[PDB]
Symmetry: C3
Subunit: 336 residues, 3 copies
């Protein structure tokens, strides 16, 4: 399209919502291509990531880790206003794995504290895609400080299986998985710092071990449990978008399955079916579609069980509805 053609397109302003929720959107595109407008303010803030009070200096798109899911349709333009307030200390930018050119946008969006920028790109490819900050010379440091999120570029006709049959979800959740590298003192106690820059050198030493101290969903151990457990009902179709900007993960819904899994995150690549545990490489997002068949509590995990149950990569679903004894029954309950 020409500059004139783009200028003539409808605009839509989106209000983003905090993960794991996703802003209001339509699965099938409503009308022709639009310029979809988003605004995010970057917040450098302390976050507490475990029950021992361990802190990370987060660098947070829209004030959350992960940043919010942005949803557009194929061949819409995503137009992001990105704001780096004067209250921040570092330069930041944004790279969309969905975008083409200038390192995914990072080359055009370098903003100091007190600056803003507006980037527009054409969402040419359908799928879920990581976005993350990547300042030249301090790339992994920003990413492992939680400066990453994802977008979803839906096909204009919504989702389909490998044979073109429509797949319509009732709910969608966005699980951003974060590897953190928290320095420890001589006694193995996690260190605290009073400025993000103060933590740099110590954090880089831990990073280079390639061994995260914490692996978490939505920025903290137990974040997506209890008050924040995801919910569904028997019969409900749920899409789970999962990203990891820096490190491999192996999602698994304990008690359920990934009925359709776009493991690569890309909708023009046919999904795998009947998945027990799928695999998302570091630097990518994937998506699983599941129809709940049993009520009860499910654990959604990274299925390295040390990472899930020692390092923090475990979320819950609470699912309402009627038990199905055909699928599963206790023929003899635990007994002498």
């Amino acid at each position: 399209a020409t500059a004139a053609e783009i200028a003539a397109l409808p605009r839509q302003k989106v209000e983003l919502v905090d993960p794991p929720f996703v802003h209001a959107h339509s699965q099938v595109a409503e009308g022709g291509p639009k310029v979809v407008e988003f605004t995010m303010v970057i917040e450098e803030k302390k976050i507490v990531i475990d029950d021992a009070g361990t802190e990370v200096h987060a660098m947070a798109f829209n004030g959350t880790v992960p940043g919010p899911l942005m949803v557009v349709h194929q061949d819409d333009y995503l137009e992001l206003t990105l704001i780096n307030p004067e209250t921040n200390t570092l330069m930041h930018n944004i790279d969309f794995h969905a975008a083409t050119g200038a390192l995914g946008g990072g080359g055009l969006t370098e903003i100091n504290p007190g600056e803003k920028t507006i980037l527009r790109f054409k969402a040419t490819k359908p799928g879920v895609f990581v976005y993350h900050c990547a300042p030249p010379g301090m790339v992994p440091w920003h990413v492992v400080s939680g400066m990453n999120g994802a977008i979803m570029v839906l096909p204009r006709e919504g989702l389909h299986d490998g044979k073109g049959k429509a797949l319509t979800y009732d709910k969608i959740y966005y699980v951003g998985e974060q590897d953190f590298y928290v320095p420890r003192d001589e006694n193995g106690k996690y260190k605290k710092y009073e400025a993000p820059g103060d933590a740099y050198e110590d954090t880089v030493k831990v990073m280079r071990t390639l061994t995260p101290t914490h692996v978490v969903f939505n920025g903290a151990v137990g974040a997506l449990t209890g008050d924040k457990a995801m919910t569904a009902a028997v019969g409900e179709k749920v899409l789970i978008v999962h990203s990891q900007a820096n490190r491999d993960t192996r999602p698994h819904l304990i008690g359920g399955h990934g009925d359709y899994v776009w493991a690569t995150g890309k909708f023009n690549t046919p999904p795998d079916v009947d998945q027990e545990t799928w695999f998302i490489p570091g630097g990518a997002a994937g998506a699983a579609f599941y129809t709940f068949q049993q009520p009860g509590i499910y654990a959604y995990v990274n299925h390295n069980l040390i990472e899930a149950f020692e390092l923090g990569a475990a979320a819950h679903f609470k699912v309402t509805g009627e038990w199905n004894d055909d699928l599963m029954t206790s023929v003899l309950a635990p007994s002498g």
Copy 2:
């Protein structure tokens, strides 16, 4: 199906066999859906995991690491009697990745020492699937103590390739791969412990490094070598089911290939073909189908070669038959320049 309908179904009692062998079964289903019955006693037992005598307090389904392969067909019910004998000290359960609800069965199978339970589930999806113990609060500790196996749910019509052609194996092996995290003393020597619980804290520390001290097939370094090497012949079609309940692996048949590989383990997901090295993420099983074309020794490995040859993740095949010089030949044998 109603309770009455399930009750009307035929029952078949299966006798399990120790890995890497698999109990007698039919590739194509014989008759309609059945309730296939299995029994396993859990054994907390000391095992030796290398030639040095390094010990693990294993938590073993049916007394083996891995637990045995249970084979059913799609829409059969798998009915497991699970027994935790009074001689054990821990509560245990079982989670079938194949199953739907109650955390895969875990929520319904928590048995203390001296207890049993019987779980039935409908095997709705065809493929190979991990099973493992997962007691709330102690999940990875049971799994990395060897308390895991796999099941195969064959399609009722047996295996096919991605394009409708029947695939029939002559033999099947189940390779369970296990990451062990054995504590070391100040000299770097592996520690031995009196009771399993004595090892807990030291073991969790190693686990947290995400660096196994041993990565093994069938419970020990070299377990599938020597007189325990797997066997085949030129022209023989072999299915190798491979599981890893906790940690990624990248299986490779050195000297061969994976002709058809269901890397995700799921038979409705078309297999990759002509594979050198395939990838099974932790918490999953995969399966590779290969027709041997050359005689001799093969090494079947996790192709992180450090994991294979330093940490223990290598098995052997001994293959009989005639050498094929078309496929490969030594034009000039090692000789002076």
Copy 3:
């Protein structure tokens, strides 16, 4: 083919070229099956792998890390003369993952210093495949000393997409990724050794941590950056073959995509499409096809960004041509 038929096949000597470049070949096979002849001399030599003068006793097929890409077509034979000069101190061999029998050729090619050997195998399967040295009892040590490369076995009719439409590249690069495990003294300084064998015990200790000290392309930090960046033009179609003989990787073209990715490296397995980040497991090669749409500098990385930007796994592309504002534009440049 019968004995006489095999004997009657044309023999063709091919001159090799150092990575990331690839020797002369045709995408579509020229004529019927051939015995393609290659020669490689093994060089044991000290190489510097970083900006701090860190040394590795490299074990290098053809003097390079990775060894060079050999290109044949399906049902050709690859006939390699492998030479181990008497100036070397170790026995070596070669295993082709493409080959069938004798551990991939290793059983037939065990050459001491002052020995040569000639191995022929039929390239029965189309794809990119790892080759590496693997002396019994010293397999990972040779491999992580850089003694590995890849071959490409093109389909006789060249590459195709999932729909059988031809994919014809304008150029091809071969990126070999190497995990190194360099010992350090107790002050954290990388150690140096007089002979390769002197480093053996110390190196195996680092190897067993499963944590490389360096993860590099073309044998060294920054080998494929700056004046040695790979090149392309807007509209150019590029195939990027990527191998990792020992350890997982997750390639990503920063600013671009993998339009078609044979992530498993096997051409009979349909390519994934529209990929952000693909995954090649340790012990395999993969290949990505991309058509450049934007000019400028791209970074091509292993998207564990710690491995990329701390440990060395980052290359560049320098791409010429006209910027496409439809795909991406700075609506508002960074500003107060």
